[PDB]
């Protein structure tokens, strides 16, 4: 019951690899060998948001594409109006070791978490005129790496204890727990239909789950180091992962294998964040060499650079309407590019 | 953009200015504190280090914060011992602390290990010290090395020689020689002797000298950092 099970697992792995090898006839680069390149992408910094006094660790965009939240190492969450660079809200945190933040799709709440293993839900629309701590979700045994809202009542979080959870905010109890990973889970991304999500962990693997069933659906490998970022394709049938070996990869849900690899010889630092444009043609990745890169998704050629930061680029996001790109850094400044 | 604003936009700008002023005041208040990171070889100073300091405060839990004040100087100690995760993922969050307090129980040299075989707990302490001291994020941060339980070390050293831990050791079996050898071996793991100093101190006095030693080391670190700036402007 020990060696036989291992042999059966090895046979299943060999069968899976053979099945996914038999389904590959031509590469995506071969298919896209005829389409015209996007050319050269030039972006300019239209706005710089100042006011933080430490390293910015996370950011998120509102669904109205105007308000954005940022989290800094000093115990602050700042909610900014991007058009006028006005600070709409400043929220002090009980614990200053914050690693992630999220914006509710309705704009009523914000989320926070970090080294305290707690996800704090803050209510913005209060009759008293202030911002309160609506809820405190506890139960993870490791630091909080990511959190994303499903609706005003549900939120999915990932932690460093190799598990992910789906919570009920009104009760504070863990509704579902996903536990299949081996290393710390670092990233999280919800599908546009919000029925399934993908997580990337330090064991160089990505897993596709099911929110309703609470069980693992698919597993993807190929990276040679920890996976720091993950993002869904706008269609919902693919995703992109950024890792610590200075390489991004595109995986397809239906093909069940890799499609393209985005890497360059003169790129050696790891990727901290990835994002897709509105159409999915451009892939934006933030690096540790202080500047971001814009890649042609369908051709795997670098299309542009975003170099305006003096330190590592930590957070990166694209608006719902795809008009601007907001990038944070380990200096105290956020930049909006157009 | 001061004449084309509406009546409701000038009030929003004023609110933003007030928020920025409060942020500046709180950020200048938070820059006058001394932040120390307490790592230890499992934090062998479970009682003396975190109880001797007169702490006043201003589903397992994660980081633990302790506040105290000594001679009109505020100290915040951060302890991360219950964080059972990859260290290389959250250790860069502490880049910029004033000092790192490393606690080692030198009385735990005869004990081999727990839940393992054929190893020494002292060797694990040295491995952790080597990993932390030569970290890329801590190339400048200074280390205060506390050595605990010196009374038990003297009580036990008579029965068991120090050669059980260090095969190459050759000397007397008294307090001073063994302590000097252990201190030298611990301080010989510093491969970056420049711009980093180790402040060793046998802490088993169980008196008010621990906070005094921390205060002296912190003051020396701050003054060396100030003189490192080398800028009249």
């Amino acid at each position, epitope marked *: 019951e020990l060696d036989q099970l291992r042999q059966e697992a090895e046979q299943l792995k060999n069968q899976i690899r053979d099945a996914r090898k038999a389904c590959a006839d031509a590469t995506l680069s071969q298919i896209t060998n005829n389409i015209d390149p996007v050319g050269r992408i030039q972006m300019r910094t239209r706005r710089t948001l100042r006011g933080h006094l430490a390293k910015i660790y996370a950011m998120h965009w509102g669904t109205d594409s105007r308000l954005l939240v940022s989290a800094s190492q000093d115990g602050k969450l700042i909610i900014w109006d991007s058009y006028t660079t006005n600070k709409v809200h400043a929220i002090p945190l009980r614990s200053s070791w914050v690693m992630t933040c999220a914006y509710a799709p309705s704009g009523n709440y914000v989320a926070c978490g970090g080294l305290d293993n707690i996800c704090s839900i803050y209510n913005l629309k209060t009759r008293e005129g202030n911002v309160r701590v609506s809820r405190e979700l506890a139960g993870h045994t490791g630091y909080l790496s990511c959190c994303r809202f499903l609706d005003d009542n549900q939120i999915v979080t990932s932690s460093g204890d190799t598990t992910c959870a789906l919570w009920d905010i009104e009760t504070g109890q863990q509704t579902t727990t996903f536990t299949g990973h081996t290393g710390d889970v670092m990233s999280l991304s919800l599908a546009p239909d919000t029925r399934l999500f993908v997580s990337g962990a330090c064991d160089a693997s990505a897993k596709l789950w099911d929110v309703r069933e609470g069980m693992c659906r698919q597993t993807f490998t190929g990276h040679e180091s920890d996976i720091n970022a993950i993002c869904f394709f706008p269609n919902g049938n693919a995703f992109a992962t950024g890792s610590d070996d200075a390489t991004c990869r595109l995986f397809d849900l239906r093909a069940d294998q890799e499609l393209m690899t985005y890497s360059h010889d003169n790129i050696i630092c790891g990727i901290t964040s990835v994002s897709f444009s509105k159409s999915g043609r451009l892939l934006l990745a933030g690096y540790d060499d202080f500047n971001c890169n814009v890649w042609d998704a369908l051709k795997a050629d670098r299309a542009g650079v975003l170099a305006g930061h003096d330190n590592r680029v930590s957070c990166l996001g694209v608006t719902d309407d795809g008009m601007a790109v907001a990038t944070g850094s380990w200096d105290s400044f956020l930049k909006i590019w157009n | 953009m001061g004449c084309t604003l509406s009546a409701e936009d000038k009030a929003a700008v*004023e609110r933003s200015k007030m928020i920025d002023r409060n942020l500046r005041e709180d950020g200048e208040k938070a820059a006058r504190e001394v932040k120390l990171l307490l790592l230890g070889a499992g934090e062998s100073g479970k009682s003396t280090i975190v109880k001797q300091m007169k702490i006043i405060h201003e589903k397992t839990t994660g980081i633990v914060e302790t506040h105290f004040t000594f001679k009109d100087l505020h100290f915040k100690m951060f302890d991360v011992g219950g964080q059972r995760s990859e260290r290389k993922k959250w250790i860069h969050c502490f880049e910029g602390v004033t000092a790192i307090i490393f606690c080692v129980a030198l009385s735990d040299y005869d004990l081999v290990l727990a839940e393992d075989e054929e190893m020494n707990r002292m060797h694990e302490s040295m491995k952790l010290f080597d990993s932390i001291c030569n970290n890329k994020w801590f190339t400048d941060t200074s280390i205060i090395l506390f050595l605990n339980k010196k009374d038990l070390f003297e009580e036990k050293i008579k029965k068991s020689p120090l050669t059980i831990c260090y095969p190459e050791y050759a000397g007397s079996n008294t307090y001073e020689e063994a302590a000097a050898y252990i201190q030298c071996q611990f301080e010989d793991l510093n491969k970056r002797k420049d711009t980093k100093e180790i402040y060793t101190h046998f802490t088993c006095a169980t008196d008010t000298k621990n906070v005094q030693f921390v205060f002296d080391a912190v003051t020396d670190v701050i003054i060396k950092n100030n003189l490192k700036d080398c800028g009249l402007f």
Partner: single-chain antibody
Amino acid sequence: DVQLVESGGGLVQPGGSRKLSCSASGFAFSSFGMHWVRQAPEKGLEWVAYISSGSGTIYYADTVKGRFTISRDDPKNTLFLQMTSLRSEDTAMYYCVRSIYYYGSSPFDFWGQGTTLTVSSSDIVMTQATSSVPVTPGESVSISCRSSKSLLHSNGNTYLYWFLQRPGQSPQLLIYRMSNLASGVPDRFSGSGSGTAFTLTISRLEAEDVGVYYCMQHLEYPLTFGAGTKLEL
């Protein structure tokens, strides 16, 4: 439990002085700008004074400028209005209104209860032509408001507010910025219109809806109210 309670009103001989106080309880008083608004007997509403958050901006109406002073005490949560040389046209009921200004806020959302002062014996003009209409329950009604200047700003905001005052009650905010429904307001009410022509529509009229409806502009100071349209039956 948001509460604003006014006090200090009585009978004053002409040429005297009087102080009105407004005490707030149940909300963050320091974060709200505050207004004093008066209503003459059997007449409409009239804006009097405004003080910002942090007291950095103060505005008065030309009728009361020079003779009236407005102030706030934040630690005590109080708002003061000092009036000197009280003429015979200052006999009215005074309301203490709170308003907060940021992107997406709802100003003028809470009104006080009012205190009665009885003394012994260019600006944008808003027109509410219809003084009163007969209304049957269950029908649909429309109230029209007109302006002498275009309230549509260059930033895309139309600064028109609809308030309702029930008999023997304080005014309440129905609609802000011509389209947004205030919290606690049923879905029956709606607002629409274009520059210098706005409409407030009530569908399936029910009880506790009779009273006076006012349209106010917030494009630039001074803030001017309408004459008020009365719904009866």
